[PDB]
Every structure is written in C-alpha cells, then in structure tokens.
Design an enzyme around this catalytic site. Structure first.
Site, PDB file in Angstrom:
ATOM      1  CG  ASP A  99     -35.322  44.572  85.126  1.00  0.00           C
ATOM      2  OD1 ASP A  99     -34.825  44.301  86.232  1.00  0.00           O
ATOM      3  OD2 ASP A  99     -34.741  44.262  84.060  1.00  0.00           O
ATOM      4  CG  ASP A 105     -23.096  46.610  87.918  1.00  0.00           C
ATOM      5  OD1 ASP A 105     -23.717  45.820  88.650  1.00  0.00           O
ATOM      6  OD2 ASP A 105     -23.643  47.589  87.346  1.00  0.00           O
TER       7      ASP A 105
END
EC number: 4.3.2.10
Lengths: 253, 253
Positions: free
Chosen positions: A11, A130
């Site tokens: 990330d 997602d």
C-alpha cells in the site's frame, strides 16, 4: 500446468510504502525500491503497488515510483488505485509498470479494458473487481466499496473477459484485512465463469488460507496484511503449498 | 429519554447525489437540494452527504453543495468524505453544514477533533470510525478500509471522547452494503466505552435490522442502500420502531 503465484500488495501513500511494521533487517521499509527488491529476493512472484489515497499528487507521485521501481526490480509489478483513464494507464506502462489495475474506471467505461489491451497487450490489463454478497447475490462495488453498482458479479466477470482483460484481481471487501481467510465461496463462484487468471485478494491470515484459495481455483494469491505485519514467511509458505500439490515456483528460494 | 434518530446517507460524486434508483416522484433525484428536502418531508431526521470520490474538485464541489443545501433544508446534515484538515472543516461549517465527519484525518491528528469542537462546538464534530474484527479483535481502519492502523477500536473510542467529539459514526465495513443487518456485536462492544451518541452504519436491509441496532445501544441508525434503492419506507419504519418501544420522532409524518 499453470503456475500458482504468491503476490505481495504494498500500500502506497505519497509515493512511499505505508510503514510502521518494523523491517529491522532493511534500511527503509517505506522505500518502494528497497522493499520491492527485498520481496523479489525472498521468493515473492509479483508485486502490487496500490495507492490507497489514489487522489492528490497521486498521478505524479505514482509515475515517479514506477520510474524508480522498474529499473531495480526483476519480478513483475502491477500499479493500481485511482487509475481513471487510458492516458494515466498508458503513462504508467510506458514508464515500466508491467500491468495496471483498473476498477471503477473499467465499470464506467468497459472499452477502457480493450483500449489498454490492444495497445499494450492483454497481459498488461488487470481488472480489479471488488464484490460483496448482497442478500445472497454477489454484486460489484465501485468507489472503494461505497457504491453498489447493481451489476451482478456473474455478469461483470463474463463481460471483463469479453473486453480483453488479461487477469482478474478478485477482492472480497468483507474479508479484506480480517485475517479470517480468503472468500473461497466467491473464488469458487467466479472460477467457472472465466478462463482468465484469477488473483484472489482479501482475508489471508495463515498459510492454510493460501491452500484453500488455490483449491477453490485461484491462480494467484495476493496479500497485504500478512506480509506488511510479517505474520507469514514466504519460503515457508511456498514449501507448504508445494507439499500439498500446489504448483508454486520454488526456484531461487 | 434520548431521541433515537433515523439518518439517510446520500453518496455524492461531483456535487450531485449518485443516481440510478428511479425516484419517479421527483424531478431530479441527483439534486442534493430536491432529494434532501424530500427526505426532510417524509420523516428522515438528519442527512449525511458523503463524497465517495472525496478527491478531485471535491473541496470546491462540496462547498457549493453545502451552500445550496443549507438554505433549503430544515433538518441537520453532516458532510463527510476526505475532510483532511481544520480549514476544510471550518469552511464547510461556516457555509451551513451542521456537522462534519472526520476519520483518517482524526486518526492522524487527534487534536483536530478538539480544534473543531472548540471553535464550532462539540456537536459539529462527528468522528467516523470504520472498524473490522481482525482475528477476534476490533481494529480501526483508515483510507477507505484499506489501512489497518493497528489501533484497537476500544482504545480509539475512549480517545475520541476524550478529545471532545460530539458523536461517533460507527461503520462496520464488512456489513456495509450487504443488507445483512447492522453489526450489533460491534455496537454492543462500543456502547459501554462512550457516553456519546453512536450513529450505527453499514448493513441495514430491513425494518427489523433497525430495531436490533437500537436494542444494541445505537442512538441513531444511518443507512444508504435501503433509502437509495427504495427498499424501506421511512414512515412505516418509524411506526414499527415506536411500536417496539424505540424513541423515534413521529411528529410531522
């Protein structure tokens, strides 16, 4: 048989990898170059650099990250997080990203998938999907899981392959970060609907979770928390998976 | 006894409410003014305008939305989504937002909570806490659920009240949009740790889910999907809740 890959998700915020996880064996675990090269040397197959702000200074800071990482790492990497158009995707690939991950922009303009695939090859385009189970039906969510698009996961998977994507990055938002296991029901649901490589994401917490993801049909297992918090050893994981018949690469370990 | 509130969450993109839900009874369900006033007239107690991009043109487009909504709606509204600093929060409240919701910015600078409360009053500051159960422990997540901060929900709730917040907007990311029910275990967990009003968010799918959220200790129930997809009638919901002993306001219905 097809290779089964282990992929680390790093990330990113302001062009640096989110820290706070103490890599005392490294000079700076926030440096994308040093950390990416480290993973490359201990057995990770590919990386994902996900901009988790994906907003301000993003475009320019991600371009600089790609430029630096591409010249120093020898395993494939994908860049994702807020890639909103063809030009942004093109700039990243031209500077050295092997693949780009698109999600909300793909749902809003499905031919974006085809545009990137035709220019750079299908292998350069990863469509991140997602999903969540909504009253018993898997649905596609955009905008960092805040918008139920009303599109059934079944229909979008089929469309993404028709549009020319190279791979699907399938994230179960409701298991992401929980360390409770991958969403093997979701992986099994998607497996018969596409021939493309499926990168399972969200939920890894222990070595056995990776085995279950591969037994459910995943071609790759992406994880953030177990590598970021140093909860699982990569070589240990690969040896366990190979012992249980999963075709992971042990070369170089 | 304390009032129990029903709050509608209106997801915003480029200063307009995400559409596609057919409000054939309205001229334009994407208009924040018309839609906000509609909810005001059918019994909603408060609104939340959540910028779900919370990125580009955001600051300026949200200021314009606040200016227009504030002069036309007569129930309180909160603005949230990417409010990164004191100046942004101040500009929104000065233009008419009754409350601002801060999350990642509060975790990264807890005295931001106190700054807004001291200038505008504690009632103007809503701290949105997004949490997930990680290996049996509730943890705080920032960056739209992509960063496990490592901070236990128990500790952050106590700190948020110490810093002067007026209310906590408690979201269970793993139930959000699922229509499977609020996370009543999470609500019950937080209830004894704070005296502040708790706005439960994420998971509403049917009228009984609201009853369970209030029985678990919520002071308000926020919902996006059931109002956006017109799955629950507000007056029907309030009459059912009042019949089951919940102190909702029936005046004006």
């Amino acid at each position: 048989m097809l290779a089964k890959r282990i992929i680390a998700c790093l990330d990113v915020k302001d062009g640096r990898v989110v820290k706070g996880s103490n890599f005392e064996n490294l000079r700076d675990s926030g440096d994308p170059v040093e950390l990416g090269k480290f993973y490359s040397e201990i057995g990770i197959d590919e990386l994902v650099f996900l901009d988790i702000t994906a907003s301000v200074e993003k475009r320019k800071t991600m371009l600089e990250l790609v430029e630096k990482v591409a010249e120093q790492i020898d395993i494939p990497f994908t860049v994702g997080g807020g890639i909103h158009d063809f030009e942004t995707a093109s700039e990243l690939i031209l500077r050295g990203a092997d693949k780009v991950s698109i999600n909300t922009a793909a749902v809003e303009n499905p031919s974006l998938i085809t545009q990137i695939a035709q220019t750079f090859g299908s292998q350069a385009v990863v469509v991140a999907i997602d999903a969540k189970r909504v009253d018993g039906e898997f649905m596609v969510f955009t905008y960092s899981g805040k918008k139920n698009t009303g599109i059934l996961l079944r229909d979008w998977v089929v469309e993404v392959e028709k549009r020319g994507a190279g791979e699907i990055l399938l994230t179960s938002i409701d298991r992401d970060g929980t360390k409770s296991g991958y969403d093997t029901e979701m992986i099994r649901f998607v497996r018969p609907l596409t021939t493309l490589p499926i990168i399972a994401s969200g939920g890894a917490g222990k070595m056995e979770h990776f085995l279950e993801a591969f037994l459910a049909g995943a071609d790759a297992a992406l994880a953030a928390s177990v590598f970021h918090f140093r909860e699982i050893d990569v070589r240990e994981l690969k040896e366990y998976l190979k012992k249980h018949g999963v075709n992971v690469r042990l070369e170089g370990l």
